[PDB]
From a paper:
Here, we report the structure of the catalytic domain of a soluble [name] ([name]) from the unicellular green algae [name], which shares 40 to 50% identity with the soluble and membrane-bound [name] catalytic domains. The 991-residue full-length [name] protein contains each of the domains present in well-characterized soluble guanylate cyclases as well as an additional C-terminal domain of unknown function, and has the full complement of residues necessary to function as a homodimer. Each [name] domain contains a central seven-stranded β sheet surrounded by several α helices. The two monomers in the wreath-like dimer are related by a twofold axis, and a central cleft, formed by the dimer interface, contains the two symmetric active sites.
The three C-terminal residues of each monomer are disordered, as are residues 564–566 in monomer A and residues 562–565 in monomer B. The final model of the [name] dimer includes residues 467–563 and 567–653 for monomer A and residues 467–561 and 566–653 for monomer B. The model also includes 8 phosphate ions and 99 solvent molecules, and was refined to 2.55 Å resolution. During refinement, we observed unexplained peaks in electron density maps around five of the fourteen cysteine residues in the dimer (Cys 499 and Cys 592 of both monomers, and Cys 621 of monomer B). We wondered whether the apparent modification of the cysteine sidechains might be due to the addition of dimethylarsenic groups via reaction of the cysteine thiol group with the sodium cacodylate [sodium dimethylarsenate, (CH3)2AsO2Na] buffer and dithiothreitol reductant present during crystallization. We will focus on one active site, and refer to each domain as monomer A or B. In the [name] [name] described here, the catalytic residues are the metal-binding residues Asp 482(A) and Asp 527(A) located in the β2–β3 loop and in strand β1b, respectively, the ribose-orienting residue Asn 599(B) and the transition-state-stabilizing residue Arg 603(B), both located in helixα4, and the triphosphate-positioning residues Arg 571(A) in strandβ4a and Lys 640(B) in the β7–β8 loop. In our structure, the corresponding residues are Glu 523(B) and Cys 592(B), which are situated close to the locations of their adenylate cyclase counterparts. For Cys 592(B), the dimethylarsenic modification of the thiol side chain prevents potential hydrogen bonding interaction with the exocyclic carbonyl group of a substrate GTP molecule. The modification also results in distortion of the β2–β3 loop that contains the metal-binding residue Asp 527(A) and the base-recognition residue Glu 523(A), causing it to adopt a conformation incompatible with binding a metal-nucleotide complex. Comparison of our [name] catalytic domain structure to structures of the mammalian adenylate cyclase suggests that the [name] catalytic domain is in an inactive conformation.
Author numbering:
A (entry chain A): 467 to 563, 567 to 653
B (entry chain B): 467 to 561, 566 to 653
């Protein structure tokens, strides 16, 4: 199995259910798990249309997606970002007791490779991955929180319409600029 | 595959490298990654002696182990606490030396498979989230365990567990916790 490689510029997304602990508040844990799995399967079937993208369902419930690590792209930020929008509408296709997500993206260097022996897994590693994770957990319900590194990697700023700025700290650095994007 | 199941009592352990940012900043990402995989292979080698245990190296870098979800194991907190002392040992033979922060908690865990073309064994719930918080809220070079996990421990007397006390834990409110130092 090939060694770990460092992709100089890829775009990583995280997504998470809004009000999950509250939804699980009034449901069985097996009820909420199959609610999680249902939403996962809608993402996996919408991601049929986005081949450049790689996704892993993560411990903690976050859905992760990556672009330009599987296949090269350059266009990655843009393709990933449109998929973010698809995620949002596919989130409302699976109601509960309807479902909203929070999405974060970030662009940067990403190390990828295999860990484990009997039980191997593809691994996505580094500061880019970690920051994209705070992007999502510091982002806004129903919206798409994207970093400055990611905004700039867009090859087609002009058809997305990103006006709202924000910030994020995250504790690992100072304060970075971010952009919000509603999907309405 | 069999559907998801709720296991009414299991123990979950998360481990993290202490000051990873200090290590990464002052060297390369492909190298630090090798540091990480070095550690994992040592964990992965020690854990073959602990067949009750199932491990998962997680997307954020945390090494995660669970007991009583795969093979029935009634002293699941005991076995896993013991493996946590082992992890601290395996960590001190990686380079100076690497230190880890370990956290543990016990409770119900849902387990099942998610995904199709690439299925994943999934461990899900409040117990897993809390165990993770036991790690983030713990202490470098030590093992930090919840009261629930102390309770499930059958052989309280085999470990030098000290009561830490009441700390507040993100999302959880007040929890009573315990520490155990290796060495």
């Amino acid at each position: 199995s090939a060694p770990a490689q460092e992709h100089p510029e890829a775009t990583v997304l995280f997504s998470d259910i809004v009000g999950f602990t509250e939804i699980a508040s009034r449901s069985s844990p097996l009820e909420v798990c199959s609610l999680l799995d249902e939403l996962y399967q809608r993402f996996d079937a919408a991601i049929e249309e986005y081949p450049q993208l790689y996704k892993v369902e993560t411990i903690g419930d976050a859905y992760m997606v990556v672009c330009n690590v599987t296949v090269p792209c350059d266009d990655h930020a843009d393709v990933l970002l449109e998929f973010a929008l698809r995620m949002h509408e596919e989130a409302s296709r699976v109601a509960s007791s309807p479902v909203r997500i929070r999405v974060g993206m970030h662009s940067g260097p990403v190390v990828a490779g295999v860990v484990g022996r009997k039980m191997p897994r593809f691994c996505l590693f580094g500061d880019t991955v970690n920051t994209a994770s705070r992007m999502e957990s510091h982002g806004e319900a129903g919206q798409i929180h994207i970093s400055e590194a990611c905004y700039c990697c867009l090859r087609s700023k002009e058809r997305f319409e990103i006006r709202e700025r924000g910030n994020i700290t995250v504790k690992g650095k100072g304060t970075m600029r971010t952009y919000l994007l509603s999907p309405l």
